[PDB]
């Protein structure tokens, strides 16, 4: 059951390359695409993400997209650049100017059909494709505007395939330009319709984590992306390694998403670790469980205690007692059952994988479908309205053909989404 991976834009390609770097190591694939591991467990599901080529060489089923060449040139000269199939580098030259309109309507439109040719070519070589995944930001123009155009066109050509995303939500604390609330609001509308799972990475939670917990005084985007790739590896562990039970993306989505529009998840990771800084003391199951449920370990800057969990998935990695896991997981729910909806019975599920990640004997990944995520969308809406009530910076968009009405529309849909979350918070 193959997955096709797509990464779009500055942020999308930088976190995306880290993903392939991290899991390529987990599967014993070197920067040449050659396997040099010890176990057979790390090749049993390798077809999920890698195509097998001549010479017993493994090639990521990855398509790399940008409207400017700078970041993708840096990928090929990068730590694992050689592994990617060179025909899958699809890029323009003009850039998107941190402008959703350019990525979605004018510059991206020019380029999108070329991208879809590669998607189709990678799909037709799939025995049974089980879905697509995208990495991208919502604050820029390529990943935000063109990424959501791709998603719309993928759903047109593959309407029954699962589509999941890691979407970096913008924040003023870690910010490139002032129009990010505009691009994020326009993108969220598209995600609400055309994705099955969206893992919301709020770039300020990554910042607070890097500063307040890893004691990094001036974190870079690189430090921020180490946390993201840890989560990306964690949430895909049970598809990449033989384990307790195997569910395809559809079955996983069915049991996590009770309502089609409420598919924006809160990811988290324990233990939280910085690059290089070596961790020597392994965590106990109680420590992993407290930390992965703690607000400080969440990567969407939302207090889980301000909402209620609709569903929760937790993925523990390493050698540990699944009995101790069961008891500790059941202890968290039974101790804070007022933050779980009583009308979805047994809505906290768990999986264990014996293969730990690089550098940790033991880790846990948290996937929370909480109504508290509305706080993230309330933040974007406030920032959106603060400029939009004065029509500020809109000339960048009206000059690409957009009307004020599309912004009003985008604003209203996200205020609906916020109110939808509030309905189930009080039920």
């Amino acid at each position: 059951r193959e997955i096709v991976h797509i990464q779009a834009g500055q942020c999308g390609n930088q976190i995306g390359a880290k993903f392939w770097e991290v899991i390529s190591d987990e599967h014993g694939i070197d920067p040449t695409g050659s396997y040099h591991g010890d176990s057979d467990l790390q090749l049993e599901r390798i077809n999920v993400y890698y195509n097998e080529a001549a010479g017993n060489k493994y090639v990521p089923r990855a398509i790399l997209v940008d409207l400017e060449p700078g970041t993708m040139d840096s990928v090929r000269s990068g730590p694992f650049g050689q592994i990617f199939r060179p025909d899958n580098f699809v890029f323009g030259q003009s850039g998107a100017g941190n402008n959703w309109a350019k990525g979605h309507y004018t510059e991206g439109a020019e380029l999108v059909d070329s991208v879809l040719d590669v998607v189709r070519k990678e799909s037709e070589s799939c025995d049974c494709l089980q879905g697509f995944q995208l990495t991208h930001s919502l604050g820029g123009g390529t990943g935000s505007g063109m990424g959501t155009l791709l998603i719309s066109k993928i759903r047109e050509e593959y309407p029954d395939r699962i589509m999941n995303t890691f979407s970096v939500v913008p924040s003023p604390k870690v910010s490139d330009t002032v129009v990010e609330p505009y691009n994020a609001t326009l993108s969220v509308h598209q995600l609400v319709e055309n994705t099955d799972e969206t893992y919301c990475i709020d770039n300020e939670a990554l910042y607070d984590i890097c500063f307040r917990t890893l004691k990094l005084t001036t974190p870079t985007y690189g430090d921020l992306n180490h946390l993201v790739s840890a989560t990306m590896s964690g949430v895909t562990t049970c598809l990449r390694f033989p384990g307790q039970l195997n569910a395809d993306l559809r079955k996983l989505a069915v049991n996590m998403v009770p309502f089609p529009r409420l598919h924006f998840f809160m990811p988290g990771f324990a233990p939280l670790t910085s690059r290089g800084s070596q961790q020597y003391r392994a965590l106990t199951v109680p420590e992993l469980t407290q930390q992965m449920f703690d607000a400080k370990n969440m990567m969407a800057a939302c207090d889980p205690r301000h909402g209620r969990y609709l569903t929760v998935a937790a993925v523990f990695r390493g050698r540990m007692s699944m009995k101790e896991v069961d008891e500790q997981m059941l202890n968290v729910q039974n101790k804070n059952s007022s933050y779980f909806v009583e009308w979805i019975p047994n809505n906290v599920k768990t999986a264990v994988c014996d293969i730990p990640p690089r550098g940790l004997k033991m880790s846990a990944t948290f996937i929370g479908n909480s109504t508290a995520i509305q706080e993230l969308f309330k933040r974007i809406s406030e920032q959106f309205t603060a400029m939009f009530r004065r029509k500020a910076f809109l000339h960048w968009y009206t000059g690409e053909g957009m009307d004020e009405m599309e912004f009003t529309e985008a604003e209203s849909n996200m205020n609906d989404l916020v109110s939808e979350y509030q309905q189930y918070q009080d039920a």
Binding site: Y105, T106, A109, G399, E400, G401
Partner: protein
């Protein structure tokens, strides 16, 4: 995208038209300004003809 093309075209168009009538109106005004100056100098010539002429009508 069609609206954006239409808007880049109308701006190019109206700029071409606004400039062309400016350069014409400026051509008209400057000519009507130099001609008026010349014609005062030519009324000047007749007058001087009438002064030399009147003096001959004096003997």
């Amino acid at each position: 995208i069609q609206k954006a093309i239409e808007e880049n075209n109308n701006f190019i168009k109206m700029a071409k038209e606004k400039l062309a009538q400016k350069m014409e109106s400026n051509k008209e005004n400057r000519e009507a300004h130099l001609a008026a100056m010349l014609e005062r100098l030519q009324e000047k010539d007749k007058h001087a003809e009438e002064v030399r002429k009147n003096k001959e009508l004096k003997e």
